[PDB]
Symmetry: D3
Subunit: 350 residues, 6 copies
């Protein structure tokens, strides 16, 4: 079985990680590192083989831990991921994988010679809505896709009202997710279009973005996040030469988790029928078709399943290096020049 450890015990760890791990028989969470142990938030876990320590080395030196998940503040990712790759352990890093496009390459390179797996945490590649469009595009019955719009909107006027560094903005904390899974399906684009700003406060950190990733001359996928959307856009708009696929309703795992409903419970991550995506396409006979597509089951744990299969079964790494590095690049160059801006992408020669 796989023996893992954690560095950090905050919100994300307690919501998007551990909860799904209580079901994986093959994964063994041995030790969790924490700056300071919170008896109330640690007890529940200590009642299990889990050990909390305040000494980082006491985990980095443990020849038992095989991989460790870093989920602490962004200002500490590069350093930590490097220290863990230094020991003979694999890493799993929460957004952002790294600060600069250079550091990311380095880390990935270091992991190779050390013969360990370095991989960013892209759980939202297991969202039902995404999984649904993934499936469709995979079956290719919609023909050749020419446009795909992806939204992550809210109605929170007044939410973001202060200035801050680019890493604490929408594009960085939310775009990474949408952009990531689109890149994992269609590849690295040739050119990118940027619209990033704060529609409510001049210089405040970005709380709005509209990013276009151009693939050739036909295909383009848009990444849109707005915090002032009263009536939601479709979660995913997909147009192909043969038809379309519209999917309303986002994955509910995040809401269930926020409402004490955990993964083991029945129907968890199950989408509402009213929100099943609608497909409208004409077949070879020119016959128009309009049907619903049962939304795939959204399970964030599936990320931990691929990491288990990638480490102990040499299976192919879920998040390829090319995507991981491409993500940082697009994300980093959005702030290279005032918005709106354009930026071409040269091939990746790793």
């Amino acid at each position: 079985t796989l023996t893992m450890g954690f560095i950090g015990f905050g919100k994300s760890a307690n919501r998007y990680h551990l909860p799904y791990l209580k079901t994986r028989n093959n994964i063994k969470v041995k030790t969790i590192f924490v700056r300071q142990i919170n008896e109330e938030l640690a007890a529940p876990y200590e009642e299990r083989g889990v050990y909390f320590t305040t000494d980082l080395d006491e985990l980095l030196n443990d020849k038992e831990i095989q991989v460790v998940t870093i989920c602490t503040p962004a200002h500490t990712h590069y350093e930590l991921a490097k220290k863990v790759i230094l020991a003979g352990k694999s890493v799993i890093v929460e957004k952002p994988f790294c600060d600069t496009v250079e550091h990311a390459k380095e880390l990935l390179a270091l992991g190779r010679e050390k013969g360990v797996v370095v991989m960013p945490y892209q759980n939202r590649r297991f969202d039902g809505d995404f999984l649904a469009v993934k499936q469709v595009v995979e079956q290719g019955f919609l023909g050749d896709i020419i446009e795909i719009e992806s939204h992550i909107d809210y109605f929170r006027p007044g939410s973001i009202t202060h200035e801050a560094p680019k890493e604490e903005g929408s594009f960085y904390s939310l775009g990474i997710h949408t952009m990531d899974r689109m890149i994992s399906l269609f590849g690295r684009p040739n050119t990118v279009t940027y619209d990033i700003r704060n529609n409510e406060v001049e210089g405040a950190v970005d709380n709005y973005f509209d990013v276009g990733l151009h693939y050739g001359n036909q295909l383009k996928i848009k990444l849109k996040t707005n915090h002032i959307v009263a009536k939601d856009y479709p979660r995913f708009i997909v147009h192909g030469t043969n038809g379309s696929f519209i999917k309303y309703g986002e994955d509910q795992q995040e809401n269930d988790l926020k409402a004490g409903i955990m993964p083991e419970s029945a129907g968890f991550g199950e989408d509402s029928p009213m929100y099943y995506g609608i497909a409208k396409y004409r077949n070879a006979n020119g016959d128009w078709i309009e049907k619903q597509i049962k939304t795939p089951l959204g399970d964030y744990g599936r990320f931990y399943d691929a990491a288990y299969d990638t480490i102990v079964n040499g299976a192919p790494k879920l998040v390829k290096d090319e995507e991981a590095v491409t993500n940082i690049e697009i994300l980093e160059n959005g702030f290279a020049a005032p918005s709106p801006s354009v930026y071409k992408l040269e091939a990746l020669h790793l």
Copy 2:
């Protein structure tokens, strides 16, 4: 009683002009000019008092001939004591446009572009909403005009005959006559089917500072339509599905005079979802205003006979051709700043 003429008589004059004029009792069409007359399609009209010739001289004409001679025929009729109502393209270049404008102002005549789509039902609905302002500070608008005609546009040709110039000029216009002159523009013009053919797709966004941004876009490969209009404010939204039906009813052989003409289907009434001062959410349907292209002339009437200000403003028409042209000044996607 206004007296006008028609420099042309193509598919256009026989669908967006004449059919609406047989109701404007205050307007009289004395003569239609055409190189090669077609009695078959000109018989009904002739039998009502309109004469046709192939030459010239008598207070306003409408250019609807091929979109090339417009400028040439434009400054030609201004040179005569006659007001001008030009069809799109109003002018090839921005200088030529500002030219005709200057000439008109001194020649003592009225000159403006034919923006019939400013009276489209769908547009009139989001115009009404924006005026009343219960949606607060508008932050985004998206105007669509799509089709699903895969295989349609598949040949090279000048920018003057692509979607961005054909369809595009309409959506861009009504959006500008509502917000003004953008401080910068985003261009993504191309052909999603034939790498070099004239553009059959575009995604143009007009930026207005940090707050406002309106997007205009056409695509010919949309099987399930987007809403004709998406409007987001700081207090709520307004989504409108379904396009104005005037055009379609015209092709069906249905004319302006008939009943129900230009009436929207209830099922397509746009939905506004916003919250009042108290914070209560309200979600209601907005009755679509009646679409009527004939209003272009009615309004033009009050301008040439009652002096009332024209529908299309100068700042408008010019700013309209500028955005339209600079979308080629570079390969797309490109950005372009607009100065006063």
Copy 3:
């Protein structure tokens, strides 16, 4: 101002005729004949200009009564038609005659007298029909390949007795849907039947499936079933450029029963929920799914027609060609056991 009389003062008269003639000034109802007079219903009218008599002759032997409407039961339509015919115009209520002969007779035997003789086809003014009619004329659906017309109910145990074919659904309801469709596509080339009583073998027809083949293309259908829980559309229309489906019947009948009179604002008005849905393609190949606002229906518009035909001699609404055609199909429907076929 045309002057008329009525032979009968039952439900029909007091529902599809009188209330509508209340706003029609040019028409005057001088006298009404009935076997037995019920003052309760007479008074409101008597308070106006109207004489209620119990002697048939009182009416027929009048000089200013130019036209009379026969609303008395069907088992007396034929003979009575003659009475008014053998004197000064006749408007007979469904069903005109029982045989194409009597129908042919009364029809012509009326021109040798100098009076108009047309049947009562009020449902040729139903909004749902005015809708398909408005669609067909504009013809954007192209060449109509088929049309389905329903008039169903859900009344098990409804009709159990046997009776002449004049008192059957086909005659009572069929004449309505068949009429307006014939008034639209003319006389057919051949007709298919299927008449019976899906509940009581002997009982009079309470169900009927009739097809009117118009050549090789068009084929209008007419159906009525007293055992339908979930309604069929009120009107199905398929063409070469698209379709038009209309749910919900005209509401004048429901409003009349609930006491809402013709003159009331909103009378007969159809609800959006039931507006017909049209889906077709244009010359560009684009698809279009839009709603067709149901046109307002007015059963009075019939008396407005019979008015012109009598005063300004305007073209008679129900062509003698349609009247005779309708009865022909209606009659031959029992020539041989069902199902059957019959050409014209």
Copy 4:
């Protein structure tokens, strides 16, 4: 032509009164009294023949004024209503008509003897949703009405928290509208049931009520107001022996008005067709019928049309004296005993 005046120029006068009067040609608003005239909010009316004064007698002594409308603070209504009746002028009073059922009987009686019309301003008798039920009930196709539920809810958790006098709670502020129009339709009920309280803060003034009006043994009409309703109830529910009428959505005049859309604009008072009430009933033959019922046009101005018709043409008054007294009484006795209570009504003999 009817010549009237106003005592007060606050929010309600500039919202539910004047905007509608600027279209009834037969009515002339001559003078408006107010302690302080806001030249801005007064200019437009001044552009017309309306005089603004801070001297009450300047209005009461004006012999040209036939009727006045008191829309000034509630605590002053009984006083002013009287001071105006003592002068030969009819009175239109905003809510509350009076503070006590005893005072109400007084003003009405002083009115009959003084020869002038005296009636409370019940604009809500012209909300579109209410007109629809009034239309259906009169047409009588639903048969005998057995039950009818009337709602006025919101989702404002926390909105009401401080304790204050009853005249300030929901039952007195909203209940006077829903109870008034139901009573104007069915009459004085035999017994009333009361559920009045604050479902958030015990002692706080009432922000909730569920009042039952019983008519004999067959009919009961419920008046309901709750400030914690996320998913709306139907605005009206009507059940009768032959079927029912359910109506969703509330009349939009107030929202429009609040938004700045005036009574003369387009579509004002017209209901969204998606909200037309739905009627399901069986006819005498047993057939079932389900249809929408186009919502009548909502127009608070009709109150003035009715006032006019009565004061100038002697037409029967809108708000009957018995309806006025019954409103105050049912409202007053809701506090006569602790909630949940029951109260028995006796016939009136004004």
Copy 5:
């Protein structure tokens, strides 16, 4: 033996192994139920006193005595149970439970209160709300026959008050052409509205037996709808699949107390509170108000 026995029992046991019937001469008419471990059907008993006694005497011989409240396993009710337990709707401030029909002129006769709508229907909707929120501090009654002035009650509107914040109503009308939601739930963070009753009965009456596929199955069309705001203040509206319903589950818990000894499905304090509320809805001419006192046994 008869209606209930052949309807809401046997068919469910014909799939149970640990259980095995045999004999049958506990579904005696509502008139005669007191006299007769016991599994009494609804209503359990007539008066409050008779109820306690009928239960205490059972705690003497050392056997288990519990009323048959099978609708605690209706899909619709389970849905609101699951939602309330999860608590995303915050503090419940009101819930309305409906059981209506459109059967005009159905009831026009007179009879004992025990065989009235409130007793033979109120008990089903009252019990489950009681087994989730407990005994109420005060009850409100509106019980009558809206068709015949003196016939047995065929209508009722009863409100159970839980303090100052919570109230839940139980309503039954036989004259409702257009249905209310089956359950309406309002709370400080949102609502849950549920249209469409448990289908077991419809299938039972349609000959479809419990031991077959699709039984009790609810359709999406009727999946309750939840609308509420999360902590971020975001509005969420979603359908909530309806928990499969099975009346058989009643025995699984009864049997679970006889041979195993698990906690009795229907707690004593509940069953006693039930018959108490029923009986007092009559201790006075409607409408009336009955304050509940604390229980002690």
Copy 6:
């Protein structure tokens, strides 16, 4: 476990794909004297044998049929039974389940549809009524039985003298029940897939079984979600119980497994002979016509 063979190839859509999950069965040879590997490639890769020799596949367990039949080998056309796979469609299975428990009472009418909107897409065998019609006709005859009489309306709404691409066929089962089979290549707004009326209620079903659409799409049977109907199309049923109450609810559409045929005799002989009778006697007299049955 039995062995089988295919007297043809191509079948590569409504046959093989399904069989490759039925362990106790295995193909052998595909009688084809022109088996172009360009297509039979996939299958070739599988443990199957592509031959072209007559007796090779005519000697070894299960017109052109006469031959296959003459030998001791059982055959299935399209133990001897014809291939009626569409008896396992979601729609039909639904309209079938409802009748089995028949809470609708006594069925009195039902319309089976299969339409398209292919304007210009155009002997009796080549006939739409023959090829398509037998599909909608077989299952109905499989549920009720043999009708007394039958009504025909065969023709081509396209070009006067061309193969039949439309038809309205009624099957009068006495004086009460009447099932109608309809097909039209000109329908922009589809009818329901099935209409079923009865003494106590109705059941209307929209949307056809998706197996075919999945197949021509690239979705093989063994995959998940294959053949699942969208809730959007679950059938609706309005019916009154014995108490008089009206009940309206959806009916989950049963999973459509064409492969269920092989698992099976299913197709009765009479149903089979009767099936072909009506097909034939429908072209006798010109249309519109009628034809009684013995």
